[PDB]
């Protein structure tokens, strides 16, 4: 009375229960399994011609025996090209990071199994730091291609939410270990399911991700003062944190080492910062601020493009100041 | 007893917190005035006066002067876009006007 798949590398594959639980009012977990097949249909450039006769954009998907179809040709017909494992061929070496086509699919899939009720994320005190919003896949992909993480960086998402931002960075960057902290208990509860479901769907495709950890707690605590300063790149979504908890973060960011990258919604320093004898202690003394290229559908709470900012710590601006103090 | 330290110094300000606090109590604005309300207000008044004197000292330097004249305050306000929105209904005595000629009126 159910249906089941097979893992193309070898693990506990896929339990898809009966009648396809609700993801929305009109797609109701249909159209998702047939798109799951299309990514195993690649890289593996074999099933595009091997199942050319059978697969289609067919009708009649509300029944069960037609849903027995399009998986019976996966539970059986994958074996005719699987069989060749003897001696000369292993399917894949695990050291493959996913491309930006199927990583978007894996992160979209893991969101649907994990966030069972997305309207519960709207339960917060208004105009407080606990308001909820998400950053799209297209901007985090832009954020990775602007910070250029080397092999010795640490990534922390301050207020990671449900945690989809650290999962994209852990699957597209070869760094050591990635962190995400979250105070509010409703997205931190979905973050535990999001943690489990991400690892099992990433072993299913046999793709490699970096190591990561989703934690609870407040980043305005004494534990986090030391480990903010020990990380190379920081992402924070401070759009409605407010001026008090942005003033707190400006004096946690003053301890970061050279080449510290910070990506935020609202900037921690003005774009045209002049230094004089009145703002020497400011955080904008030691960092360069540029605005990223705005793209459509960048955030989750509005439709207009919200642009993010890039902060780069180099303490030479205050060394190119104090070099004109006795010039006149 | 302990040595007297002003409220402006413990706030890190140059504007007087204690005089701003007296003017809020004197001015019939509310029955009661919070402790941090004159600290917040004196910081905003000091910020805005540092924005004009930033820009007016730049105008005084471009005209090769070392003092700030009411002309330099006028040039500072009308050339900055957001100080022109605050002080858009304000006339400054001996301030003049920005040099602006319509492009139709120019010859050829």
């Amino acid at each position: 009375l159910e249906l089941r798949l097979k893992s193309p590398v070898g693990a506990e594959p896929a339990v898809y229960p009966w009648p396809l639980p609700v993801y929305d009012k009109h797609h109701d977990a249909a159209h998702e399994i047939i798109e799951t097949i299309r990514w195993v249909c690649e890289e593996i450039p074999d099933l595009k011609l091997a199942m050319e006769n059978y697969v289609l954009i067919d009708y009649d998907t509300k029944s069960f025996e037609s849903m027995q179809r399009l998986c019976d040709k996966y539970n059986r017909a994958i074996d005719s090209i699987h069989q060749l494992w003897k001696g000369t061929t292993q399917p894949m070496k695990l050291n493959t990071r996913p491309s930006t086509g199927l990583l978007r699919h894996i992160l979209q899939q893991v969101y649907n199994h994990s966030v069972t009720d997305p309207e519960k994320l709207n339960n917060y005190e208004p105009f407080s730091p606990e308001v909820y919003g998400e950053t799209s896949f297209d901007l985090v992909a832009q954020m990775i291609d602007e910070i250029k993480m080397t092999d010795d960086d640490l990534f922390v998402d301050l207020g990671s939410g449900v945690g989809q931002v650290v999962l994209q960075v852990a699957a597209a960057t070869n760094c050591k270990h990635h962190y995400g902290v979250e105070k509010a208990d409703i997205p931190a509860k979905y973050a535990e399911t999001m943690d489990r479901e991400f690892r099992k769907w990433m072993k299913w495709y046999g793709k490699k991700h970096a190591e990561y950890t989703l934690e609870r707690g407040d980043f305005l605590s004494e534990e986090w003062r030391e480990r903010i300063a020990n990380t190379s790149v920081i992402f924070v979504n401070n759009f409605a944190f407010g001026p008090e908890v942005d003033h707190q973060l400006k004096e946690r960011f003053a301890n970061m080492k050279e080449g510290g990258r910070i990506v935020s919604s609202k900037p921690f320093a003005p774009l045209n910062f002049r230094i004089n004898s009145r703002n020497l202690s400011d955080i904008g003394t030691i960092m360069r601020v540029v605005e990223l290229s705005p793209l459509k559908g960048s955030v989750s709470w509005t439709g207009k493009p919200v642009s993010y900012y890039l902060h780069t710590i180099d303490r030479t601006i205050l060394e190119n100041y104090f070099s004109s103090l006795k010039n006149p | 007893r302990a040595k007297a330290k002003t409220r402006s110094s413990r706030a890190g300000l140059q504007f007087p917190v204690g005089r701003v606090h007296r003017l809020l109590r004197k001015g019939n604005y509310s029955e009661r005035v919070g402790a941090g309300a004159p600290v917040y207000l004196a910081a905003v008044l000091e910020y805005l006066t540092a924005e004009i004197l930033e820009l007016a000292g730049n105008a005084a330097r471009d005209n090769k002067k070392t003092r700030i004249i009411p002309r330099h305050l006028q040039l500072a306000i009308r050339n900055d876009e957001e100080l022109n929105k605050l002080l858009g209904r304000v006339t400054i005595a001996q301030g003049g006007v920005l040099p602006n000629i319509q492009a139709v009126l120019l010859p050829k």
Binding site: P243, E244, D246, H247, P270, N276, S277, R278, P328 | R10, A11, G12, L13, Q14, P16, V17, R19, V20, L23, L24, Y29, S30, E31, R32, V33, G34, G36, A37, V39, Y40, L41, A42, A43, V44, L45, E46, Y47, L48, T49, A50, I52, L53, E54, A56, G57, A60, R61, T66, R67, I68, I69, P70, L73, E82, L83, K85, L86, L87, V90, A93
Partner: protein, 93 residues
């Protein structure tokens, strides 16, 4: 009697920004008119917020939102950060 102005305090700010320039006594009288004008706008708007919400005290929460109502876009963003930085330093000392 004697008077009160901001001319001691306008001059200290000027020496922090441009430590080599000066100011005439007619431009100093325009800066005193400016400080008294922005004081009346903010304290008048904050007085009106407490009466709407049926409060009898003006706190720094109401000075903050009167700054957001009165100042234009980026001026309002930096005057809020300079205001909170002063209040948090005051309460710790």
């Amino acid at each position: 009697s004697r008077k009160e102005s901001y001319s001691v305090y306008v001059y200290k700010v000027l020496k922090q920004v441009h430590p080599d320039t000066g100011i005439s006594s007619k431009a100093m009288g325009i800066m005193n008119s400016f400080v008294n004008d922005i004081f009346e706008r903010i304290a008048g708007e904050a007085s009106r917020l407490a009466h709407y919400n049926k409060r009898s005290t003006i706190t720094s929460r109401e000075i903050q939102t009167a700054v957001r109502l009165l100042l234009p876009g980026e001026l309002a963003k930096h005057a809020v950060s300079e205001g909170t930085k002063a209040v948090t330093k005051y309460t710790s000392a």
